[PDB]
Structure formats: C-alpha cells, structure tokens
Design an enzyme around this catalytic site. Structure first.
Site, short mmCIF file in Angstrom:
data_model
loop_
_atom_site.label_atom_id
_atom_site.label_comp_id
_atom_site.label_asym_id
_atom_site.label_seq_id
_atom_site.Cartn_x
_atom_site.Cartn_y
_atom_site.Cartn_z
N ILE A 1 0.85 -1.17 0.00
CA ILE A 1 0.00 0.00 0.00
C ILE A 1 0.89 1.24 0.00
O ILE A 1 1.78 1.38 0.85
CB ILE A 1 -0.96 -0.01 1.21
CG1 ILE A 1 -1.94 -1.18 1.05
CG2 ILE A 1 -1.69 1.32 1.32
CD1 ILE A 1 -2.95 -1.31 2.17
N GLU B 1 -2.14 -8.83 2.68
CA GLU B 1 -1.68 -10.08 3.28
C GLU B 1 -2.62 -11.25 2.92
O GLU B 1 -2.16 -12.37 2.68
CB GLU B 1 -1.49 -9.96 4.80
CG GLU B 1 -0.50 -8.89 5.24
CD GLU B 1 0.95 -9.20 4.89
OE1 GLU B 1 1.22 -10.08 4.05
OE2 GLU B 1 1.85 -8.54 5.46
N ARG C 1 -1.88 -12.41 -0.51
CA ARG C 1 -0.63 -13.19 -0.56
C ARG C 1 -0.75 -14.62 -0.07
O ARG C 1 -0.02 -15.50 -0.54
CB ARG C 1 0.46 -12.50 0.26
CG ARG C 1 0.98 -11.23 -0.37
CD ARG C 1 1.77 -10.44 0.65
NE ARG C 1 2.25 -9.18 0.12
CZ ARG C 1 2.40 -8.07 0.83
NH1 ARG C 1 2.10 -8.06 2.13
NH2 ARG C 1 2.84 -6.96 0.26
#
Ligand SMILES: *[C@@H]1O[C@H](CO)[C@@H](O)[C@H](O)[C@H]1NC(C)=O
Ligand SMILES: Nc1ccnc(=O)[nH]1
Length: 246
Positions: free
Chosen positions: A71, A160, A163
């Site tokens: 970000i 996250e 991912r």
C-alpha cells in the site's frame, strides 16, 4: 480497479474481493504454479486502485504497488495521503493527482514504523471485516495516530490476504467478530519475502530451499519449510515477490 463493500459483506463476497485483487496483479510466469510478480512496471500501470466502502457507503481508494502488493497511499474525498517513503512519493506522481491537497503521513509504511505510530504491535490489534469497516471510517478523516492502527488492519485484510490463502481464511472466520491475528498469520506476513525468494531459488535446486524458512503453524508450533512440497507452497502462498526486488 477492484472493489469491496462492507455493507452486506460475508465470507463469500470477501473471498470474491481477494480473488479480484490477486487477479488484478499482473504476472508473466508462474513458479511452481504460483504467479510471479513482475520485476518492475513503469508509470501509472504500477499502481492498482482498490475501492473500499464502509458499512455506511463512504469510500476510500487505496493505491497498491502491483510488483509487491505494498500500500502506497490512499484517497479520502479530496485529500490524498501517502507514506513518508520514496516509493510512496514516487506513487504520488501517478495516483490521486486530482486531490485538492496531499498529506504525507508522518511515518513510512513498514510494519515496524506503523506499530510505533499506532502505539501497539499488531499482535494486539484485532482484525476482521468489522475492523476493516472501522479502518475505512478512520481513514476518512485525518488522525495520524488512529490512521497507523487503521492501516495495520487495512494492510492485513487486503494485501496479506491476497498473498496467503490462510490469511484470507482467517479474515473470513472474522467476518462478524474481530480477533487478533494468529501467530501463524504474523509469521506468514513476516516471511513472505523469504518464502518468495526460496521458492524462486528452488527452481534450479530440485525444489529444495537454499535456506529453510521458519514459520509458526496453525497450532502455535514452530516449523521449518525446506522444500516446495510443503503445504505453505502447494496450498497457501498465492503470489511471489520477484527476487529482483529482494
Ligand atoms: C520436504 O518437505 C516435506 C514437507 O514438509 C518434508 O516432509 C520432507 O522431509 C522434505 N524433503 C526434502 C527432500 O527436503
Ligand atoms: N502490503 C503491505 C503494505 C505496506 N506495508 C506492508 O508491510 N505490507
């Protein structure tokens, strides 16, 4: 662009958002069947815009670097906010240019600095869809201390989760009740770069990691990942940071 709306959100619509986020990140190859993020992208095409709407329908747009899922900053009404770091200042050259004013946040975007600003480690910060709704609301009006905490929630429930399938599932479990992240969640977040690297290095090493990666598992137990047959690699990780950026 990708979008997510907290009004009427459930595990399904959240999963659709995370799928959309992953699929918006460009890649040219897969390594062990996992998309390999690009070494670099030039100009505005480097940045993905995520439109997030809180329960009441107010919105921020978050700018995400598509090479690393970091970000960079965000737009709230007519004010842009960027981390105090060169990658973010660079991003400010391309996104949210039409904002009436630009505020540089008084910290960089890494977890250690954010936790300092927020006054607590993210082990102590509940996350979930309710926490994400709060985070969006907080970011609508400038408060650098509150923003740091909101950004920790935001990063974990978006980047996250993109991912790691495990983290996505953890947030799905927290659709209607926040809970601090599992130790495994924290461990995966902290190991993304290491795992990405070792999975790439395994390509010419018969699927064997040059250096093993230590994780905490679902049960709180500390385990070693040595090769691509691990569930972390076959199941879990969904995106690889290019070793050229490590
Ligand atoms: C590879 O990793 C698997 C899964 O964790 C493990 O059971 C096995 O001992 C390892 N084998 C090699 C050759 O490293
Ligand atoms: N996705 C992320 C953005 C910013 N900082 C991080 O640590 N991770």
């Amino acid at each position: 662009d990708v979008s997510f709306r907290l009004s009427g959100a459930d595990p399904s619509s959240y999963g659709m958002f995370i799928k959309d986020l992953r699929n918006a990140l460009p890649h040219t190859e897969k390594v062990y069947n996992i998309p390999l993020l690009l070494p670099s992208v030039s100009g505005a095409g480097r940045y993905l815009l995520m439109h997030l709407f809180n329960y009441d329908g107010n919105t921020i747009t978050v700018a995400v670097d598509v090479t690393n899922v970091y970000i960079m900053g965000y737009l709230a009404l007519t004010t842009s906010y960027f981390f105090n770091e060169p990658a973010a200042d660079l991003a400010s050259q391309y996104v949210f240019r039409s904002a009436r004013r630009k505020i540089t946040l008084p910290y960089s975007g890494n977890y250690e600095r954010l936790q300092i600003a927020a006054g607590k480690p993210r082990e102590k910060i509940p996350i979930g869809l309710p926490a994400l709704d709060t985070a969006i609301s907080t970011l609508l009006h400038y408060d650098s201390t509150a923003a740091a905490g909101a950004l920790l929630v935001l990063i974990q429930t978006t980047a996250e989760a993109a991912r790691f399938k495990y983290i996505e599932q953890q947030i799905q479990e927290r659709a209607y009740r926040d809970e601090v992240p599992s130790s495994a969640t924290i461990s995966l977040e902290n190991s993304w770069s290491g795992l990405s690297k070792q999975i790439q290095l395994a390509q010419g090493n018969n699927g064997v990691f040059r250096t093993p990666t230590v994780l905490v598992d679902s049960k709180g137990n500390r385990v070693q990942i040595t090769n691509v047959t691990s569930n972390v690699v076959t199941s879990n990780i969904q995106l690889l940071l290019n070793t050229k950026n490590i």
